[PDB]
């Protein structure tokens, strides 16, 4: 996905599962 977030995201999912 070229429109995915290309920045560092501290609020992204940090767990192994969704």
């Amino acid at each position, epitope marked *: 996905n*070229p429109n995915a977030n*290309p*920045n*560092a995201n501290p609020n992204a999912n940090p767990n192994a599962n969704p």
Partner: antibody, heavy 124, light 107 residues
Framework: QVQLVESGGGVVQPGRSLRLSCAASGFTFSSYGMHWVRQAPGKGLEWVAV????????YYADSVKGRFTISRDNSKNTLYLQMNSLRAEDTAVYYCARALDDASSTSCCALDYWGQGTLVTVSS | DIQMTQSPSTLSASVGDRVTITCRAS??????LAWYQQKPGKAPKLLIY???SLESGVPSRFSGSGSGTEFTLTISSLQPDDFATYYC????????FGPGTKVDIKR
């Protein structure tokens, strides 16, 4: 203040190579995705390429695929565009641009800071 | 690709006018739409993102609206430094720009 200082543009013949640079300051460069956008003389804006903050993923416009390569050196806070097999249609002012960080959005990107631009003239 | 169009090409305006320019997409882009300003010889400047969110540092007389395939940039009271060209840009599928709308000085 956020600054994006570009260099490397110039006059080259069709089929030659040229390397653009975009030196960043005033923000944390290694945490931002970056774009190249070009503007032909008298025309509008055309997206060229994007690179992830860590340099992992890269995407290109169809008109430059196989010929252009986007890269970055986060230790030097510099973005690069390697332009090979240049055509006369590549003649344009090239801008580097930082990807906007909109925390709530699930699609990307808007471009919130732009370099001053560097002129690439491909001519025989 | 998603094709962006704009109307008008040149819009005649005077200081103080309420000005609207329209941007269209060849298919729905939801709300993933940005507006930029550009002056001759200068770099584009982000005005609006996500169709209606005002970029920080941009004057409040600028606002955006719309969704799907129809979008509008509104300047509530045009000021002298607003005479310029304005581009819309979608980021729902890759990244494409409209042809631009120039706002010049009415006489």
């Amino acid at each position: 203040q956020v600054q994006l200082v570009e260099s490397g543009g110039g006059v080259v013949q069709p089929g030659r190579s040229l390397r653009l640079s975009c030196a960043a300051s005033g923000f944390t460069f290694s945490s931002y995705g970056m774009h190249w956008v070009r503007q032909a003389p008298g025309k509008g804006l055309e997206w060229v390429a994007v690179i992830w903050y860590d340099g992992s993923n890269k995407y290109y416009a169809d008109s430059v695929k196989g010929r252009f390569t986007i890269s970055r050196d986060n230790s030097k806070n510099t973005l690069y565009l390697q332009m090979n097999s240049l055509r006369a249609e590549d003649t344009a002012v090239y801008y580097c641009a930082r990807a906007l960080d909109d925390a709530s959005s699930t699609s990307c990107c808007a471009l919130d800071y732009w370099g001053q631009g560097t002129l690439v003239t491909v001519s025989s | 690709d998603i094709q962006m169009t704009q109307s008008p090409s040149t819009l005649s305006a005077s200081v103080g006018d309420r000005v609207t320019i329209t941007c269209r997409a060849s298919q729905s882009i939801s709300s993933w739409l940005a507006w930029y300003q550009q002056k001759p010889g200068k770099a584009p400047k982000l005005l609006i993102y996500k169709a209606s969110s005002l970029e920080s540092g941009v004057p409040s007389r600028f606002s955006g609206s719309g969704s799907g395939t129809e979008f509008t940039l509104t300047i509530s009271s045009l000021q002298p430094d607003d005479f310029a060209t304005y581009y819309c840009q979608q980021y729902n599928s890759y990244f494409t720009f409209g042809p631009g709308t120039k706002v010049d000085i009415k006489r």
